[PDB]
Amino acid sequence: FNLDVDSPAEYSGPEGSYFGFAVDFFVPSASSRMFLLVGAPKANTTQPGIVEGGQVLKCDWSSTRRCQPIEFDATGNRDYAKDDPLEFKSHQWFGASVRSKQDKILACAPLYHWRTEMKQEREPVGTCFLQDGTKTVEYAPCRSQDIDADGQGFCQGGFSIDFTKADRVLLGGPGSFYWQGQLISDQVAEIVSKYDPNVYSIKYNNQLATRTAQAIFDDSYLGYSVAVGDFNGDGIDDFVSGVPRAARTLGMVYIYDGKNMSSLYNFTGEQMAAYFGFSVAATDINGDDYADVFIGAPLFMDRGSDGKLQEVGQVSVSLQRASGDFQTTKLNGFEVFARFGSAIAPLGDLDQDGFNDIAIAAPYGGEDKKGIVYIFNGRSTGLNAVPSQILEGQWAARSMPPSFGYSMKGATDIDKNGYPDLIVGAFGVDRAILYRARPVITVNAGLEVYPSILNQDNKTCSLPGTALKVSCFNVRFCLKADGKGVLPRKLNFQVELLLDKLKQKGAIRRALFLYSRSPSHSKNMTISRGGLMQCEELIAYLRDESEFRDKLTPITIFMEYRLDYRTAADTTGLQPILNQFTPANISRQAHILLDCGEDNVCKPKLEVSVDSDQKKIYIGDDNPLTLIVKAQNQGEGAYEAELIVSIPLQADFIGVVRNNEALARLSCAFKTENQTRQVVCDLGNPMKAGTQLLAGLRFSVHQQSEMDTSVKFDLQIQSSNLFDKVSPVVSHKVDLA
Amino acid sequence: ECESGPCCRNCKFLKEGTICKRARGDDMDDYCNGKTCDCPRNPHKGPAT
Amino acid sequence: GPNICTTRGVSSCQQCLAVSPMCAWCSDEALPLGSPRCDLKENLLKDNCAPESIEFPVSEARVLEDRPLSDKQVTQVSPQRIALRLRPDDSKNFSIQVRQVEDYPVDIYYLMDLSYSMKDDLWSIQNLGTKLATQMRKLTSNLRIGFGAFVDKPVSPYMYISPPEALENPCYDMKTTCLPMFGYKHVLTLTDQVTRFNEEVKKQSVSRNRDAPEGGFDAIMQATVCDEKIGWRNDASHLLVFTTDAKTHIALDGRLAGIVQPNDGQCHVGSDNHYSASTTMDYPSLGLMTEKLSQKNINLIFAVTENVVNLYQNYSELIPGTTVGVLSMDSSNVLQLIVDAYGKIRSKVELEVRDLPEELSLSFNATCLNNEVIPGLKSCMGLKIGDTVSFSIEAKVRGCPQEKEKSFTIKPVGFKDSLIVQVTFDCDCACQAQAEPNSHRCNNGNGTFECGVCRCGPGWLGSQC
Ligand SMILES: *[C@@H]1O[C@H](CO)[C@@H](O[C@@H]2O[C@H](CO)[C@@H](O[C@@H]3O[C@H](CO[C@@H]4O[C@H](CO)[C@@H](O[C@H]5O[C@H](CO)[C@@H](O)[C@H](O)[C@@H]5O)[C@H](O)[C@@H]4O)[C@@H](O)[C@H](O[C@H]4O[C@H](CO)[C@@H](O)[C@H](O)[C@@H]4O)[C@@H]3O)[C@H](O)[C@H]2NC(C)=O)[C@H](O)[C@H]1NC(C)=O
Ligand SMILES: *[C@@H]1O[C@H](CO)[C@@H](O[C@@H]2O[C@H](CO)[C@@H](O[C@@H]3O[C@H](CO)[C@@H](O)[C@H](O)[C@@H]3O)[C@H](O)[C@H]2NC(C)=O)[C@H](O)[C@H]1NC(C)=O
Ligand SMILES: *[C@@H]1O[C@H](CO)[C@@H](O[C@@H]2O[C@H](CO)[C@@H](O[C@@H]3O[C@H](CO)[C@@H](O)[C@H](O)[C@@H]3O)[C@H](O)[C@H]2NC(C)=O)[C@H](O)[C@H]1NC(C)=O
Ligand SMILES: *[C@@H]1O[C@H](CO)[C@@H](O[C@@H]2O[C@H](CO)[C@@H](O)[C@H](O)[C@H]2NC(C)=O)[C@H](O)[C@H]1NC(C)=O
Ligand SMILES: *[C@@H]1O[C@H](CO)[C@@H](O[C@@H]2O[C@H](CO)[C@@H](O)[C@H](O)[C@H]2NC(C)=O)[C@H](O)[C@H]1NC(C)=O
Ligand SMILES: *[C@@H]1O[C@H](CO)[C@@H](O[C@@H]2O[C@H](CO)[C@@H](O)[C@H](O)[C@H]2NC(C)=O)[C@H](O)[C@H]1NC(C)=O
Ligand SMILES: *[C@@H]1O[C@H](CO)[C@@H](O[C@@H]2O[C@H](CO)[C@@H](O)[C@H](O)[C@H]2NC(C)=O)[C@H](O)[C@H]1NC(C)=O
Ligand SMILES: *[C@@H]1O[C@H](CO)[C@@H](O)[C@H](O)[C@H]1NC(C)=O
Ligand SMILES: *[C@@H]1O[C@H](CO)[C@@H](O)[C@H](O)[C@H]1NC(C)=O
Ligand SMILES: [Ca+2]
Ligand SMILES: [Ca+2]
Ligand SMILES: [Ca+2]
Ligand SMILES: [Ca+2]
Ligand SMILES: [Ca+2]
Ligand SMILES: [Ca+2]
Ligand SMILES: [Ca+2]
Ligand SMILES: [Mg+2]
């Protein structure tokens, strides 16, 4: 979630050269300079008589971002005789697979055709050029004397390669033994020491190679993709190979022993022609020191909303256990015809949280079918099924789909800030992009508030300017930050404090700060990483007890913090990111002390009654009608209590009776909102317990329709309380005479 | 004896159409007639090579 | 008593007839002035009007030819000609019928695997082609049939690129002659010449590549998308018989040969009848194949040998709407599949109206196979051969034009036959043919007298001038 996308670094190669088909890092042991290795399998080289012979470039990161080819092989086609070329380097696709250990570079040419030593043929045996800094050797493991289609003639060795930590080379040829596939493992030392330019079929010792099988395994393409990881007791790395056409084109993944090339486990797809094994990876995603297998099936079809299959692709995550058990889960694609599981690139601990992450790329997804790379972060339980980052290609297709995300590399820190980076190679536009992870800053925010219950009567506080001596309370807020890797010591933080949250709908504000005299107060903080609390004391004072609309809704405290994002690295302005799953805002609650029993809520009992005192009115006159209403709350406090007298279309309100002391002078109003006219009268806020109100309302009635026979009123008390907030509706009838 | 024929599994002749030698690559499978225990060459396969 | 006629049509014949379908006119001078002249026919008889002086033309539908709809030229709309008579502001209803008896149109394309693995199944493939043509000509008369071919992508490692004498003949290593390899070769466009189809199918021969999977999905996709090249008819039922005896190359398999460009989707067959992008574009995925087949309305049928029946049945389960047959000495399985495909051929009847005038208006009641009259609908789906449907049509006219004659055609879309009308608006009394020019009969005034009544000119507002 922290990969920088605003300003990545792009590398452009020769047009139509498939630059960026295979990407990798360069980590020289004898130098401190870090380079990017990028393959250009269709580029043009200076070799004599070789056209589109492919090349491998090394591109700097901080030196003009220029790309210079590596001179693995500066010669042309060797001659077996007077006029008899021995090898054919034209259109050999050199650079289709680039791997790099500390000082070693293994660039392979899958389509290199070599005329046999027996008959004039053209067989894509494939060659690999191993480079150890100074001594560049040629490693063709399946250029042997058993040359035919039945053997390693169409080996295409170097289609998929990998490096084990014990200085061993894993090589995969999907064409050996009638396209059954092969895995060849030779030690780097043996390869370098056994090189001899005058002999083409060199036999290495300590060679682990898979053998031929029955004819029912043909066209399985074993070695289409190879990964390396440890999957048994010993510390020797085992070989994981994708076999995408195995088991009647279902797909499979073979795991072989890293000591003597013996099969250990097997994975199988569920859908035909889904290409299960196109890309495989072996990384520890839950951080219990046990490698986990990730298998990509970019052509997987799953049922949609209407039950029709849609090609979205799938990635299967198999979590290793203490025994041979694997807890396999499926990660379905997101867009149809996107090839989700095309390339799987373990990023290592991208955000430095403890568990390694992973990036799976759909190279034909997104808008304009440019390309999408998803990023899934590993957790203790396993792999998060929701991507935490989306990377979009930004180069439109010219003649071929850009294929952004067809091949990526990860788990190598190139700017030395402590976070692994990612190279994404889009060869449809001949581009390579380097995404550098931003530092992750976690924040442990805190918001300590004074006791939630606020007493309105308790007014032992001072005020500026007027000294009204009203109630006040204090709010304490503070936060710490700490992140791994390179990070500036002092991080600028600004915190905004909002008073009476979840109520900003044009209403009034009740709680208000003592000094700023505003519901909002912002302050700047320069906190130090890994430090203790840095808490400032703020004082807020409530308004008048009879000023705000209601005292029921709790007062909410809101504190939102945002990183300055100007604490960027001096290298390329890499601004640190905040942790993705932590909230960026803290909300606390406050209550206004109100005697409401032990349940902490006021539950009133509202009663209303009325007598006629006239019991009859004459039709033709405007008769003065006075209704004696008794409004009593025998329950607890009733907040914002008013009685509702919904008079009919006939009469209208005149005024409250004030000529007698037995009745009250209730403040009353005439309302007409929402299709109904009615009379409201304030009953007290709040309306205390056991309070019995008695008052009279004068009216004036003049009949509408000559056959009406009655005048019916409706009386009801309602309050803004949450439970038992309304009185039973009482209907009073006056008979026309 | 039963001669352990490629199509004469056990001793009885197998059904006509059984494959005795699966074809590797774009080639023609070798079938057995069901009256001879051997694996006969496919008639129209080449120059009877 | 008073009615609409007595307040609107009391002027003369034309407006009395234009008021209402039931309005009637009296042309008898024995009727005293004051009595209504435009009223009910019964009311007119009650006023003692002469029946010969009663001008009450009733709208009626007069069918002219009513030969019944044929069964299995052919007749497919009955009646085929109606003489329709409307007075102004009137509606008349008649019933038509559409019985689909004509045969369904059908398009069959034949994809032949011509690899060296098919040198034994060549006779089976040609026999299936001839039997398919014969069977579909027997089932339906409107049939167009063609065919094509495929081997694989002509690139290494699929192809034989050495020795250079094996580029023109891949069977050099076997010491035999076989034709050069190709991706997809469209041979015969969709034609009704079964003799030509049989000749060109029997004139085929095999090629040779290296690996067992073939590029048949590329051929399927090209035959699907190259509408103009293949000859797919817009209004027809398309069937695509795909033949193979080995496994099939799926998408992402071309990365071995160096092809990393996904199948774009367009048609790439050129003027040489060859798949031009065979060596630059990958094999098509099952999802894309499904999408294109559904878009183009094509019924893929797998006619594969016994050893890949299960493999292609599972592929068909992944491709909805696809059936798989067995290729053998007899073509009974694939022929039954073809017959069933013809059996689930469902026709629809979309009624259309041409040169419809502005004045006339129509109302449709579709009485489909459920026999439920559905107002507002005029197109019943699901019709079969020998199946009969009807439609209730009521024609309403607003007023009357001066054309005095019009004709419009009713026709089902995709149907040769049609119903034609001859709408003749009455718009007037018959007695106005014997009208008097001016004055004379109508007293000393100089108005006009017609049909037993007089209507003066400007100024003279009297009943009889
Ligand atoms: C993950 O999945 C992988 C793929 O399924 C598994 O790999 C497969 O494991 C199988 C064992 O589980 C293994 O089968 C064994 O194959 C060898 C091959 O040696 C043969 O040598 C013969 C003489 O050269 C030739 O074939 C003869 O035999 C076959 C019948 O098998 C006949 O049809 C032929 O005409 C010919 O006479 C071949 O050249 C071939 O190289 C066999 O020797 C083994 O025989 C043993 O088991 C059988 C019972 O099945 C016994 O009767 C016999 O006495 C032996 O004890 C097996 O058949 C597959 O070859 C192998 N395939 C690949 C590509 O790896 C993998 O095991 C799995 N892992 C896990 C952990 O499950
Ligand atoms: C690497 O250098 C080679 C040098 O040969 C480039 O190959 C050449 O590419 C041009 C196109 O830029 C080809 O021209 C073409 O000629 C054909 C007729 O032969 C014509 O139909 C086309 O429209 C186009 O004009 C040229 O033939 C070809 N040379 C060959 C094949 O020997 C290659 O493009 C360069 N690659 C990169 C990635 O720069
Ligand atoms: C009436 O309101 C005033 C506010 O102006 C209350 O005074 C504050 O009350 C809080 C608790 O409600 C107390 O804070 C305490 O401060 C000590 C340090 O002196 C600290 O060790 C405690 O943990 C606690 O935070 C304190 O009494 C006082 N604080 C300040 C800054 O004025 C008063 O308590 C209210 N009275 C009633 C009866 O509600
Ligand atoms: C290759 O190595 C594996 C393990 O490293 C060997 O498998 C073990 O063989 C011994 C002796 O036969 C058994 O006692 C163990 O139970 C085996 N471990 C298993 C099956 O997990 C294997 O024998 C070696 N040689 C080969 C495969 O040829
Ligand atoms: C306050 O924080 C919340 C979450 O801590 C955010 O608001 C939304 O919260 C829901 C549920 O947690 C999330 O699904 C949404 O994604 C959040 N919105 C956004 C834009 O991320 C948000 O950070 C803050 N919201 C407010 C109103 O301050
Ligand atoms: C086609 O699909 C069927 C099942 O839909 C496959 O038959 C299964 O084969 C596996 C082989 O491991 C068995 O374990 C199952 O028991 C079989 N199921 C049934 C119902 O038979 C069949 O193998 C598939 N064909 C191909 C060529 O893969
Ligand atoms: C289509 O069907 C509807 C209903 O079956 C017909 O409406 C009826 O028409 C008759 C004749 O005018 C009336 O007597 C009924 O009262 C109508 N019923 C309803 C429910 O409206 C309609 O006339 C038919 N239209 C045609 C063109 O046949
Ligand atoms: C806090 O910092 C922001 C930007 O750094 C500034 O605009 C604002 O005035 C500052 N406020 C205070 C109180 O320092
Ligand atoms: C027109 O509809 C009426 C129903 O109101 C029906 O009786 C009559 O038969 C219909 N006309 C014809 C020609 O069937
Ligand atoms: Ca191991
Ligand atoms: Ca693990
Ligand atoms: Ca992480
Ligand atoms: Ca970094
Ligand atoms: Ca209470
Ligand atoms: Ca065959
Ligand atoms: Ca092939
Ligand atoms: Mg074949």
Automatic annotation (TrEMBL), chain B:
Subcellular location: Secreted
Ranges for domain Disintegrin: 1-47
Stated name of the protein: Metalloproteinase
Top-level taxonomy: Eukaryota, Metazoa, Chordata, Craniata, Vertebrata
Part of the whole protein covered: 427 to 475 of 482
